[PDB]
Design a protein around this ligand. Structure first.
Ligand SMILES: *[C@@H]1O[C@H](CO)[C@@H](O)[C@H](O)[C@H]1NC(C)=O
Ligand SMILES: *[C@@H]1O[C@H](CO)[C@@H](O)[C@H](O)[C@H]1NC(C)=O
Ligand SMILES: *[C@@H]1O[C@H](CO)[C@@H](O)[C@H](O)[C@H]1NC(C)=O
Ligand SMILES: *[C@@H]1O[C@H](CO)[C@@H](O)[C@H](O)[C@H]1NC(C)=O
Ligand SMILES: *[C@@H]1O[C@H](CO)[C@@H](O)[C@H](O)[C@H]1NC(C)=O
Lengths: 345, 337, 342, 341, 340
């Protein structure tokens, strides 16, 4: 009977203790753990964290759980008595609150192989934290990590190891809300040395690249429209002074409001950002246009002959020069932040 | 014989019954009939791509061991205690597309177990799942979402468990009313995915696909009319006397400022997506037309320093821009059918 | 010896199996339940639900608990011994997450009478969901319901009945944030027919009345003031075209900002609300004032001055009358005729 | 032997049952309770609740737990045995979610005296609910309460009395974000009469005085500057009609947006608040200034005979009257809402 | 045998009670505790709270747990058996909600030394509260604390001490979004005297300095640009009176909107703040420019030497305003840099 087999294998009469690691006072027990991402998203820079729904699985071996009576080489099992068998320790380093899922049943799958290998797959919901750098907000590349390491055992007793083929699988059709998950994934070791000793560790890196289209169409187009409107005002003659000054003031108002909104919709980072410098350049251009208009007005009332001609000449020269300066600054900014110093590694 | 005695001798932690071993072991995979019952809806947060439900999931599984012992006093179909139900074996149930699932316990566990001589076992719970679906906002003002729910088995593979939907109306709903969308019971088409995991084995997964179409009334009454009014203001800006020429600029600058403010507000009350949205198309077109009006005024002003040509240009613009915008509006309302 | 009394009544030696309902294989057991509202408020229109702190009490009878050993007829218990006795199943259909209260102890009270009647009062905290009808948002009268029904039994085993004399009480001095809870409360039956069988049900209906005052001072007064400001723009002389056009522009700007901000704390309802109608009509009137100012400009730029003055004064004397008649019609219709007073 | 003494006094072999109230079938057991406010804050008028971190303690006596073997008159126990002895039922009538604390252990202290007196201090975190009135919002006084009462026992079984000396202590240097917690506190009885019978009760009142510095610096000064800008508009010559138009309309816009923001920053109250009336009067003054400017334009344009003189006279009259009206309104309003309420 | 050894150490046959402190009715026991900061952040002034992810460890000794059979000098145990032995009480006095961590197992590690010393490391996630001082908001220094103290024992039974070496470690590369953690940490004693007697306590301070770059680039530059634009308006001639006055009022309105936004993005405090006074002075300067231009326009229409005096006054004011603004700016920056 299978129930008798379960009782004899790891039950009370089996003389097996779940509080003792396999191969006690001997070689350390190896673990081949792999994960399966089921969902992603909710990357909030305000809290500097993101959510995952991994399908964490663990593998190991122990001669005590090996069997030779039942004909089948792999039998399923239930979590209720899985609580009564040994489970290697595994906690995530950079996490801020994770929990299991208990919906209509337990979400733990336990399988025992004939050779003694044990398959342990359990469904988890995590909220990992990765620092975010905003050296170039619209065109940055984020690298959020997931560190797995033991807590109750050292390198002498427990070790970890990534699976050889397909270690970190991703569910087909998964799409990030804003970013995009690149195919390449980094796997390495993160062996930490606390005050208590040496602990084994496992690290996997995710390469996330932000998509510029949304931020472009929603923020850069209004600034370009405002500066072209400023040039349109620039083309206005000196007779309609109130209209020109009103247009300049309105442009500066729009620029300030857009900059405030853009910088308020983001975490308060100490250093400067690409969007911040772009909007500062646009604001400075609007300010310079208004200042030169004021200078033109001032020089118009300086006949107390050629003063009007000089004002017209300087207005025409500035109107011919400012768009070229804006174009060269824009192309320089785009090329530098696309190739020269960012989008590297 | 007492009814409790019959319930115990059928199954109990003391009586010789093992809930751990599946029914029909080393035999035909268990056939489980699953039907759902929607009780509420809503909380469709587009910014987080998740909708909250409250279901009355019912699943019928038949166990040879969990069968009436005859002469217990069955008469009417027996009702089994939920604690007995916890003792009773349960096939694993999980849904892949849920941000989270929470059970509902309003002063009692919401679990009812039914036992019949057929030995078939009817089990019903009350869940409060918060599922997740990928929203598609390409044609956001007139889109059609396909948020779906799929039930999967976790502990057992296809070789031991199998799920089949109820033959007669497997999905019901008591005329639930939604704030934004309008779920229609006509199209609740469902299939199954039986997805396979590379490393563990096969798993049977049944699915349910809803149909939620966003209602444009709120948008058509709150975000479209002000833009049209700003457009008509921009049109009116043309015909004003160009002698002063100091009053036409305020209309254009107010138009562009108001359109920018509306765009920012609508972006605030909207999830961020890379692809362009029809609302963004309409807003940018309105902004571009206001800008075109302002640059038309600028061209007229620069041409005024000839009066006949400026007057003809102004009249032609005031005559053609409304017609051009009518053409654009009809084309836009045709393409976003 | 209360311990021996409990052991003889519902103890291990009592032979009282809690899994067996009273009057097994017989008539269904009757339960009379009454609630005691302790708090209210926090009605979130966006989430379409509200919160309560009821003091649900349940009353029923069972001969298995009949006793005569103690001279006293009514003793007391604790939740530890409550867990060992039968408890009638109950849950709320239109709920979205409820929980008990665990503050320094359990919040469940048990009392057993000599005749066999048992009182079971337990403190709860519910989050019930009720659809909101927003046909006339600033004048709406909401009706939120609280449904009680069984889940573990049918009409053949468990039934329900409201308590007769004062079943639903309200704690004195209760203060709702926005609405006003009507004293008169409806009570009736809601017996449902699920797939599994016929389940008993119990429903109590509330009545809520929204207050205009807040929304009044928020929206209506600025609209009237900006309409009078538009009339002020109208009365300006014709040659001051930039002044009049600027006043029209600022009036339409503030009107559209007010309209946009009016629905900030409201759900994206499909149909049209009263505040939406008011905002739309005010915006249309300001727009028409600007349009007629433009028309006056066109007439003056084409006896022409006489015609411009006559149309200006005619429209300036007619527009306030139109606004007044619209205002009185709208207020009377939405206060009596179309959607108000039931 | 400590373990043997614990087993003999409150252990399994002690023969004492925790489900039986002390002095059964007798007079109700007196209970003296005192709290210790550990923190405060997070007072959100939107949800009508505030948070506390009380340090509730309870004292009572029972001859069943009395001992006379240990020479020491007071010993200490652990929660794992605290839950095994009788405790008085106690819940908070006005609360919307409270829970214990668990950090490396439970946060419950049990001390038993030789004569039978029992001390019981348990750390709690509560979310109380107190109705708030905003008739005079910037200078209001709020009195949030805390009702302690039993749920499972009547007056014949359990009673509650405050400690005579220092019943409610406050953590040294308590800092509230907006309000300030006055040292004086009110204590009384709140004996209720429920349908099930008569239950004991205990109340305590906290007097809160809202500070108006933030509200002042945020709202009062800008409105005053805007009305001074309107007064500046009063002195502009009639020729600069667009100038006065722009000043009036911009003052209207800033008044509207400031009023909208200020009213949105506050919870939803049906009746009228002081800030509401202040914004309304400021907007009315701005509107009246614009209307008088329009009237000046109309009377000036009525000539097309001493109309310039009349317009100048009415402009001077307005510029000399509106400041006086604003001053008298401001002083009257401040005096009324400072002393009359 | 391992299982037999565990049964002999703290099992039922061992005769060991976990509800009795070591050295009962004797000298108080000494406990040495050190923490390991693993993360930081979420310092929100709205709720005056911040979140940590410490790795609190406890070290103490009890003669009842000594052993000499196993050759190894330090074995390990499990949380299931950890809860079956005595654990020293320790709770954080200044916290507003903390919780354990369970991921595939409990996150508690227990180690027993041969000499009898016991190591107890437990992972916790805390939410500590510190009174934020906003006297100088963009240039403040925040001192958030962490008080550790016992609850169930007095000074006569339990005492707390720090560890002499590396009492508070910090994970390498720990970065904060707004603030920066100073390396120096202050450690003291906070022995409290409640109504029930005398309780041990332990306090550790963290020094956080706000970085002005974000607030500077967001608010200080636009206000200066607005006041320079007001000066630009002042440089306009007298003829365009409506233009200059309208642009001045628009600058006033945008200054008010910026002030309202800055206040909205900041938690409310009773007293004044540096940003508050800076924006108030900027608004005052813009209003003063508007008022002086209004006075110039009024004196221009006073009914031929009036225009000369008006021009002289305008030139004098346009010369004096930059001097006043510069002296105010330097005084403000130096006082808030060195004075406070
Ligand atoms: C465990 O696997 C490792 C490689 O991961 C191998 O070197 C070792 O021999 C295996 N066995 C033990 C007992 O460590
Ligand atoms: C489930 O999908 C599989 C795909 O192989 C199919 O054979 C089977 O009939 C499906 N079952 C149902 C109930 O649709
Ligand atoms: C309970 O009351 C119902 C009516 O509410 C009645 O039909 C029934 O007979 C009563 N008692 C029993 C024991 O069924
Ligand atoms: C408890 O104190 C009350 C007054 O608070 C007193 O009446 C009573 O006698 C005292 N003791 C008992 C055992 O009832
Ligand atoms: C623990 O050490 C302290 C000094 O750190 C000492 O006063 C105390 O007596 C010690 N405890 C015992 C039980 O010896």
């Amino acid at each position: 009977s299978p129930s008798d087999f379960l009782d004899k294998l790891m039950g009370r009469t089996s003389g097996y203790d779940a509080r003792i690691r396999p191969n006690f006072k001997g070689p350390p027990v190896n673990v081949t753990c792999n994960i399966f991402i089921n969902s992603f998203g909710s990357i909030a820079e305000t809290t500097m964290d993101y959510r995952v729904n991994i399908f964490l699985r663990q593998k190991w071996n122990d001669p005590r759980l090996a069997y030779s009576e039942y004909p089948d080489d792999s039998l399923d099992l239930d979590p209720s008595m899985l609580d009564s068998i040994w489970k290697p320790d595994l906690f995530f380093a950079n996490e801020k609150g994770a929990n299991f899922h208990e919906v209509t049943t337990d979400n733990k799958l336990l399988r025992i192989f004939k050779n003694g290998n044990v398959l342990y797959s359990i469904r988890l919901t995590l909220t990992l934290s990765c620092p975010m750098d905003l050296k170039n907000f619209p065109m940055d590349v984020q690298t959020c990590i997931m560190q797995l390491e033991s807590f109750g055992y050292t390198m002498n007793d427990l070790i970890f190891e990534w699976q050889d083929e397909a270690p970190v699988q991703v569910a087909e059709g998964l799409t990030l809300p804003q970013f995009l998950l690149k195919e390449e994934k980094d796997l390495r070791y993160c062996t930490k040395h606390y005050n208590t000793g040496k602990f084994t560790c496992i690290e996997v890196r995710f390469h996330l690249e932000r998509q510029m289209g949304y931020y472009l169409i929603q923020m850069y187009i209004p600034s370009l429209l405002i500066v072209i409107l400023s040039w349109v005002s620039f083309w206005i003659n000196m007779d309609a002074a109130p209209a020109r000054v009103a247009l300049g003031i309105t442009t500066v108002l729009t620029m300030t409001t857009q900059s405030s909104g853009s910088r308020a919709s983001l975490p308060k980072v100490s250093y400067v950002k690409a969007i911040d410098i772009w909007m500062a350049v646009c604001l400075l251009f609007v300010f310079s246009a208004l200042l030169e208009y004021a200078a033109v007005n001032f020089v118009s009332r300086q006949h107390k002959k050629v003063f009007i001609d000089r004002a017209k000449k300087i207005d025409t020269i500035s109107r011919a020069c400012f768009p070229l300066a804006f174009l060269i600054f824009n192309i320089f900014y785009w090329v530098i932040y696309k190739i020269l110093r960012h989008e590297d590694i | 014989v007492p009814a409790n005695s019959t319930s115990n001798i059928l199954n109990r932690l003391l009586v010789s019954y093992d809930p751990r071993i599946r029914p029909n072991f080393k035999g035909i995979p268990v056939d489980v009939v699953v039907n759902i019952f929607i009780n509420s809806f809503g909380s469709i947060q587009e910014t987080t791509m998740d909708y909250r439900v409250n279901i009355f999931l019912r699943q019928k599984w038949n166990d040879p061991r969990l069968k009436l012992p005859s002469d217990f006093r069955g008469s009417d179909a027996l009702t089994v205690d939920p604690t007995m139900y916890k003792c009773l074996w349960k096939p694993d149930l999980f849904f892949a597309n849920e941000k989270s699932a929470n059970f509902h316990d309003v002063t009692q566990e919401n679990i009812l177990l039914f036992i019949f001589r057929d030995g078939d076992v009817l089990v019903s719970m009350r869940l409060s799942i918060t599922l997740s679906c990928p929203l598609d906002l390409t044609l956001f003002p007139m889109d059609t979402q396909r948020c779906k729910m799929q039930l999967e088995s976790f502990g057992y593979t296809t070789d031991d468990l199998r799920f089949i939907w109820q033959s007669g109306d497997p999905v019901q709903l008591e005329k639930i009313a939604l704030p934004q969308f309008d779920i229609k019971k006509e199209d609740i088409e469902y299939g199954n995915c039986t997805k396979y995991y590379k490393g563990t084995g096969y798993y049977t997964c049944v699915e349910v696909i809803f149909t939620l179409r966003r209602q444009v009334g709120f948008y058509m009454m709150g975000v479209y009319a002000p833009t049209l009014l700003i457009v008509v203001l921009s049109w009116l800006s043309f015909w004003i006397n160009p002698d002063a020429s100091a009053a036409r600029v305020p209309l254009g600058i107010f138009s562009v400022l108001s359109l920018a403010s509306e765009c920012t507000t609508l972006a605030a009350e909207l999830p961020k997506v890379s692809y362009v949205k029809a609302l963004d198309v309409w807003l940018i077109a309105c902004l571009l037309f206001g800008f075109a009006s302002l640059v038309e005024y600028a061209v007229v002003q620069v041409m005024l320093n000839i009066p006949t040509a400026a007057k003809r240009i102004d009249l032609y613009a005031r005559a053609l821009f409304p017609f051009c915008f009518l053409f654009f509006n009809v084309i836009y309302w045709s393409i976003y059918l």
